[PDB]
mmCIF file of C-alpha atoms and ligand atoms in Angstrom:
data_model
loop_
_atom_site.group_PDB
_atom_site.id
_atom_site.type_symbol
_atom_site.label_atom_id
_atom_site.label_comp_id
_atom_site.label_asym_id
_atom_site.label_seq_id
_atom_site.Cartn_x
_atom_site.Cartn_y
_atom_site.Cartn_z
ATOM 1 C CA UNK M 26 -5.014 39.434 -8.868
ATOM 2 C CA UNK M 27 -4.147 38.254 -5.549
ATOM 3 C CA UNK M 28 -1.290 36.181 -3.492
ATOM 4 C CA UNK M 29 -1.048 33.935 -0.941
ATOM 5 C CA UNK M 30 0.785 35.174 2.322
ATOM 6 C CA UNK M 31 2.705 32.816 4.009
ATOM 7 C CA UNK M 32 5.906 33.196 7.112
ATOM 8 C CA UNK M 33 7.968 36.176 5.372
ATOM 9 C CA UNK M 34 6.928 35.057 1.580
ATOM 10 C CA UNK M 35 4.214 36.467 -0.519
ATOM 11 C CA UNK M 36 3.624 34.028 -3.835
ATOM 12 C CA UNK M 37 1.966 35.510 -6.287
ATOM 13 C CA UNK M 38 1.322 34.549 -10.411
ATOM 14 C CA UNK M 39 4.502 34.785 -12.116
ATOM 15 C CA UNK M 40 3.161 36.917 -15.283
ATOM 16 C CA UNK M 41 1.119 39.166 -12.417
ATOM 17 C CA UNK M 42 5.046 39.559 -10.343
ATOM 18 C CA UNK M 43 5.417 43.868 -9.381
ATOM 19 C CA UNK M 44 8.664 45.437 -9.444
ATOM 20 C CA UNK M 45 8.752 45.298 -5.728
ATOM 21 C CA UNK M 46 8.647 41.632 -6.009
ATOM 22 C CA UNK M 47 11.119 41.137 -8.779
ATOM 23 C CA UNK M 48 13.891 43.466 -6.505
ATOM 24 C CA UNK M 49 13.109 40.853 -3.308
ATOM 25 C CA UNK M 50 12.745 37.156 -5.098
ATOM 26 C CA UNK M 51 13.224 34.483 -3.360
ATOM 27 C CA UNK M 52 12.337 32.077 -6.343
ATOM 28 C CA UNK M 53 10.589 31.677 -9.921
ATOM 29 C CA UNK M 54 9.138 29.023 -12.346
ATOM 30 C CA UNK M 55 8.268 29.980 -15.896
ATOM 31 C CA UNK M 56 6.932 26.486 -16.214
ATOM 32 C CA UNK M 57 4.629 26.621 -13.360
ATOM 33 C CA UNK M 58 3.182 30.507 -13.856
ATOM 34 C CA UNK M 59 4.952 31.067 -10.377
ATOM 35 C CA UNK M 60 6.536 33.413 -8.441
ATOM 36 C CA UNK M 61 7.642 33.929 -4.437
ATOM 37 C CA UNK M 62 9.223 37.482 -2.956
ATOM 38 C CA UNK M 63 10.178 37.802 1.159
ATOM 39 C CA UNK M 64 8.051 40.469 2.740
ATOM 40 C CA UNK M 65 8.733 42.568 5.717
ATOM 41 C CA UNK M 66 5.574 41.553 7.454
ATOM 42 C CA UNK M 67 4.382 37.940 8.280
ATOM 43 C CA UNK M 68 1.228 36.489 6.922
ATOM 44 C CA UNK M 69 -1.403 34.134 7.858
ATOM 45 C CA UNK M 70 -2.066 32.059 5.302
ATOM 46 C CA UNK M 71 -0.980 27.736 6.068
ATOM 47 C CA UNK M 72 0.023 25.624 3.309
ATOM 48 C CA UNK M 73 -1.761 22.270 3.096
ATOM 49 C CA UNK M 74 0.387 19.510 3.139
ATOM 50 C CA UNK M 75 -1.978 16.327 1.562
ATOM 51 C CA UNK M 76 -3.520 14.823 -1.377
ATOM 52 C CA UNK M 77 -7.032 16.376 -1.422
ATOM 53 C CA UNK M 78 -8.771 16.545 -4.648
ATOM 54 C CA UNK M 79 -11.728 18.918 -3.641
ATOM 55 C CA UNK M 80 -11.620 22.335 -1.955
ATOM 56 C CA UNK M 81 -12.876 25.498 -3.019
ATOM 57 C CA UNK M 82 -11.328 28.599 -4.552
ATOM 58 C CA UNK M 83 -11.995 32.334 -4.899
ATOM 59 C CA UNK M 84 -13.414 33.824 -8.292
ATOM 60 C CA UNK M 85 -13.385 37.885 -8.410
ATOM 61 C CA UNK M 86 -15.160 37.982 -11.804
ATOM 62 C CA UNK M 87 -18.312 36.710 -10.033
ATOM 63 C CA UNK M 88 -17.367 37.464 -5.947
ATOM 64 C CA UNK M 89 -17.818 33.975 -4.992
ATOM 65 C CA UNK M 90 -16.298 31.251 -3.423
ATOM 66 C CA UNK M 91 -16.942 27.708 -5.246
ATOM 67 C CA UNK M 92 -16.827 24.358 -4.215
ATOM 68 C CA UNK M 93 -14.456 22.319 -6.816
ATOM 69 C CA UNK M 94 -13.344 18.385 -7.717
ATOM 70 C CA UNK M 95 -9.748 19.227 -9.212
ATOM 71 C CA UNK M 96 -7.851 17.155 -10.694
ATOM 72 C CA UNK M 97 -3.425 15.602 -9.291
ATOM 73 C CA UNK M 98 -0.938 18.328 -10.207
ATOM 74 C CA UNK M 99 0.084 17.800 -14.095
ATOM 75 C CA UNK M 100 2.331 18.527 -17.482
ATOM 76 C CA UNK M 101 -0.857 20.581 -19.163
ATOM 77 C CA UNK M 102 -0.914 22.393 -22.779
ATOM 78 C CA UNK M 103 -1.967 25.906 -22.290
ATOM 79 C CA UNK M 104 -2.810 27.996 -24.999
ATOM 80 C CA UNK M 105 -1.508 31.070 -26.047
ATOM 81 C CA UNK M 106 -1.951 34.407 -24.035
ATOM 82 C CA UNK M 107 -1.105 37.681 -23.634
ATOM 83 C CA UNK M 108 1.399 36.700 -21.157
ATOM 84 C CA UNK M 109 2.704 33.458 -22.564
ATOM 85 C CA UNK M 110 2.865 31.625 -25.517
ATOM 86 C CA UNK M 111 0.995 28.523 -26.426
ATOM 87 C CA UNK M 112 3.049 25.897 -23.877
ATOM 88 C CA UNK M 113 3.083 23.025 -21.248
ATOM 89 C CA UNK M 114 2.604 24.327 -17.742
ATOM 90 C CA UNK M 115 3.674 21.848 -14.840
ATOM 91 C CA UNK M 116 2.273 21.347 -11.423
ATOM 92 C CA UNK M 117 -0.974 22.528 -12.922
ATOM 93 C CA UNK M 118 -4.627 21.450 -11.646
ATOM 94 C CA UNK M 119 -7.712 21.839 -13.605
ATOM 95 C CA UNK M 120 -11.695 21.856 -12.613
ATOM 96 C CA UNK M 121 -14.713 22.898 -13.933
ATOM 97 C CA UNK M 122 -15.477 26.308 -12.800
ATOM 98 C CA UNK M 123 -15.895 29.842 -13.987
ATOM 99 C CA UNK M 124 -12.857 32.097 -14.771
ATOM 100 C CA UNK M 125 -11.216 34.775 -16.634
ATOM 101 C CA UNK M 126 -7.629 36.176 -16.921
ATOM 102 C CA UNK M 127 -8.067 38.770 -13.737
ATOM 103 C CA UNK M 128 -9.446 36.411 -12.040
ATOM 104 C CA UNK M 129 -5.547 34.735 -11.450
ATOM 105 C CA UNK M 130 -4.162 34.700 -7.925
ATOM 106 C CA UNK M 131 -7.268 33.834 -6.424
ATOM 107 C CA UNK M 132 -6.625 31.173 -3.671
ATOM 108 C CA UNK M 133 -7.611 27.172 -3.908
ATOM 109 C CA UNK M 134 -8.205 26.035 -0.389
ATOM 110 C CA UNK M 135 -8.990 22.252 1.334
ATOM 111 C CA UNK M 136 -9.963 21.500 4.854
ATOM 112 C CA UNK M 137 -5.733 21.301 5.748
ATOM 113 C CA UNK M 138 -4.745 24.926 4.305
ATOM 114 C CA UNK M 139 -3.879 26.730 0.952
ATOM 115 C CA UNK M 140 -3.259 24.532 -2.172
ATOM 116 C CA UNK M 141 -2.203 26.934 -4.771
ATOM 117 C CA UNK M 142 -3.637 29.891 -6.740
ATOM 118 C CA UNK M 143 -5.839 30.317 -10.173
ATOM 119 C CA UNK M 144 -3.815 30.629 -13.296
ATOM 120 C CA UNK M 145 -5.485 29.094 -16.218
ATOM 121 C CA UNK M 146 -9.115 29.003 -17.647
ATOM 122 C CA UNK M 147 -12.227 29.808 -20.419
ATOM 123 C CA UNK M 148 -14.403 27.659 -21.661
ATOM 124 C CA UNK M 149 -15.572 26.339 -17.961
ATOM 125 C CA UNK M 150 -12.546 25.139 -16.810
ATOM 126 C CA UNK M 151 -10.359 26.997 -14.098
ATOM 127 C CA UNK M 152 -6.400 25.953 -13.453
ATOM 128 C CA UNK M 153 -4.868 26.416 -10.272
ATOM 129 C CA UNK M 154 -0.798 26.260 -10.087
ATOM 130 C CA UNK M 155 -0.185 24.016 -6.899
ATOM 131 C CA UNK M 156 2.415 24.722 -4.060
ATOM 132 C CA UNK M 157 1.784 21.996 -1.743
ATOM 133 C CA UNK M 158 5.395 20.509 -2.771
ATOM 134 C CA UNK M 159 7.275 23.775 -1.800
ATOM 135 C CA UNK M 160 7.725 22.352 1.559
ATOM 136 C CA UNK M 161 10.564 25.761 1.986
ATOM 137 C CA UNK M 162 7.659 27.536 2.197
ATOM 138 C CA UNK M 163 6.819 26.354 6.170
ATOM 139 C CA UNK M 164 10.188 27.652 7.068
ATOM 140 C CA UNK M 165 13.429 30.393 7.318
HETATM 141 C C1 LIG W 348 -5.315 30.157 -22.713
HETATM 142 N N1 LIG W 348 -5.253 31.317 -21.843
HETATM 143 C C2 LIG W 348 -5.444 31.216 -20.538
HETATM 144 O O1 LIG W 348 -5.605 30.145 -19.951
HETATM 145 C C3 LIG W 348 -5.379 32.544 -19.760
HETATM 146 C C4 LIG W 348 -6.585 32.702 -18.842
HETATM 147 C C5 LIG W 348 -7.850 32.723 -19.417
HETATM 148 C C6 LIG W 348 -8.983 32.637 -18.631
HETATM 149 C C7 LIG W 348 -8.863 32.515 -17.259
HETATM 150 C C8 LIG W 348 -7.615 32.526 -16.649
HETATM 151 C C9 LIG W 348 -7.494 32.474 -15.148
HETATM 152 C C10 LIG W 348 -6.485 32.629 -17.456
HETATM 153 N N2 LIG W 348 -4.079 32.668 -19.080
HETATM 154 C C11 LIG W 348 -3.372 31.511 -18.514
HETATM 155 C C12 LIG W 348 -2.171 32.137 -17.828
HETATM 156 C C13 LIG W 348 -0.987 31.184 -17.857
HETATM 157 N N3 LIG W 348 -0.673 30.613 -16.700
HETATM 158 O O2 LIG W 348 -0.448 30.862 -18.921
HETATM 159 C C14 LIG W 348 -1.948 33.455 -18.593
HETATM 160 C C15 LIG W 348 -3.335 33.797 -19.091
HETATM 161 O O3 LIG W 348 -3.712 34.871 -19.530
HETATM 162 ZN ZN1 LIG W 349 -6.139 18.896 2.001
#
């Protein structure tokens, strides 16, 4: 679990998304495992706006932070889950890293701010879903 908190916008995993958030959306992606609701309060988090391709990223399943390469934001195959079926998932970033499915929503962060949130993995390899395009997030 987890979300990033951002102006009035919480963005959390789209197959994680609460009632709450589905009954104040601001936007959703299927394709990229994404989803943003407005909240009442306003959070701290910054967006990074940049190409970096290290940072590190939050892993619940072992309560560590890890230092990661990762790779541009891509059209990926995903296999088949509990949440979605086998499919491509866009704007997607993979390194090598632990995680497992609760371990989604955990935050990938460079020196300039957040750059998106864990949403794919096994075998070694952990996928992060990237937001440094929504630039709509730094604003209203
Ligand atoms: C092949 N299955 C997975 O990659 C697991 C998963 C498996 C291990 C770790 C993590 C973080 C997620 N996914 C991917 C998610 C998605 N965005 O489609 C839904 C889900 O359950
Ligand atoms: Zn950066």
């Amino acid at each position: 679990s987890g979300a990033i908190y951002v102006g009035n916008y919480r963005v959390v995993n789209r197959h994680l998304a609460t009632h709450n958030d589905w009954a104040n959306l601001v936007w959703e992606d299927s394709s990229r495992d994404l989803l943003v609701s407005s909240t009442t309060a306003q959070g701290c988090d910054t967006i990074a706006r940049c190409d970096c391709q290290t940072g590190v990223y939050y892993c619940s399943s072992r309560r560590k932070h890890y230092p990661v390469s990762f790779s541009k934001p891509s059209l990926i195959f995903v296999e088949a889950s509990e949440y979605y079926p086998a499919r491509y998932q866009s704007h997607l970033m993979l390194a090598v890293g632990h995680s497992e499915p609760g371990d989604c929503g955990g935050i990938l962060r460079c020196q300039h701010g957040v750059v998106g949130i864990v949403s794919t993995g096994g075998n070694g390899l952990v996928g992060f879903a990237d937001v440094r395009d929504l630039l709509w997030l730094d604003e209203e």
